[PDB]
Symmetry: C2
Subunit: 192 residues, 2 copies
Amino acid sequence: LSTITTHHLTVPPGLTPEEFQELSSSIAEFHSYRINPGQCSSLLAQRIHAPVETVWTVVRRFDKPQTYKHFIKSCSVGEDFRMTVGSTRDVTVISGLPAATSTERLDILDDDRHVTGFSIIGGEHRLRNYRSVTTVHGFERDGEIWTVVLESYVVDVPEGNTEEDTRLFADTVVKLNLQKLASVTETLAREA
Amino acid sequence: LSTITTHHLTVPPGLTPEEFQELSSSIAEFHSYRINPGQCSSLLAQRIHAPVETVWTVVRRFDKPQTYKHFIKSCSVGEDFRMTVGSTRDVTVISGLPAATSTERLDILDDDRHVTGFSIIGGEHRLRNYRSVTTVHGFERDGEIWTVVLESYVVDVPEGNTEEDTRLFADTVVKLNLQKLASVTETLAREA
Ligand SMILES: COc1cc(/C=C/C(=O)O)ccc1O
Ligand SMILES: COc1cc(/C=C/C(=O)O)ccc1O
């Protein structure tokens, strides 16, 4: 039967024990899921040497995910789009397979606590019933500032796949996109 | 009927006109192919602030492509492997589809001119009949040194795909792997 994810109870890759103990409550609040057989979940972490609000300005741009994500041919949200929960975007993915769209819905948007998340509601790709949450957190040590971005997901393991198959693929993509987020926002910071 | 690729006649993305005019003969010599209908070819470029021999030490490691490539679960070359042309490696790719192997053959290995290339001879993935060449080149300006890596390929466009589909996917992967090559070798340089 069901199980609760345990991401809030171990140190995620890319994060220090010190940082974890500061975020353990945010991980349990926003990066916990109830998974069933046939699903897999993961938590990824990325340090960014940039202020929180700098990183969040990119993370929250639901209509321009290609700003920090790879493998996006285009993204459309149609006229009269507003940055509200329930809005959707059509993401055309670069996959070496025929041109297919991923319809995605904005699930969360908290400008004060820096939390967002989305769901893949349609699309013929390898991430069926995908749902993820991203949170942005600030850190300080002797007047030095940095940010930690946490991103988790739950997703179906396709029939004929191992959980390790799907998890390793999803982790790689998320991890790669967080490195681009780091570069983009650190450049934005070092340029003012 | 057949056509010759024209990569040696335009400035590839990631390279300056100055750099191109220096490499135009190497591009025609090593990065030209005869493509037929149903194939596509591309040339990618990446500047690396590291000496040529530093970048080449990684580029030539046919048995450890995960050193600078993404989406590789593992790579095996079996005992008694030697770095000779004709050798092969089994690359297990991270693709969100079931665990599948890419058998690849070393086509070129020139330690003096810094040229290597390989062919995908077996594997059920989106890069059928893939063949690529990588060359490493040195540059100088006022005692400052940098390297340019050029990587081209030819590959089949799968039935039901646009050429733009396949090219955009292959370009993204190669481009991403060259950025990792840049980071890895620049770190290797700045550490001696
Ligand atoms: C980068 O953004 C995305 C990538 C995918 C990838 C799907 C696959 O490779 O199966 C799907 C939806 C996305 O929004
Ligand atoms: C990173 O190295 C490789 C990636 C692939 C990808 C195949 C696909 O996604 O269809 C194939 C062979 C490789 O050596």
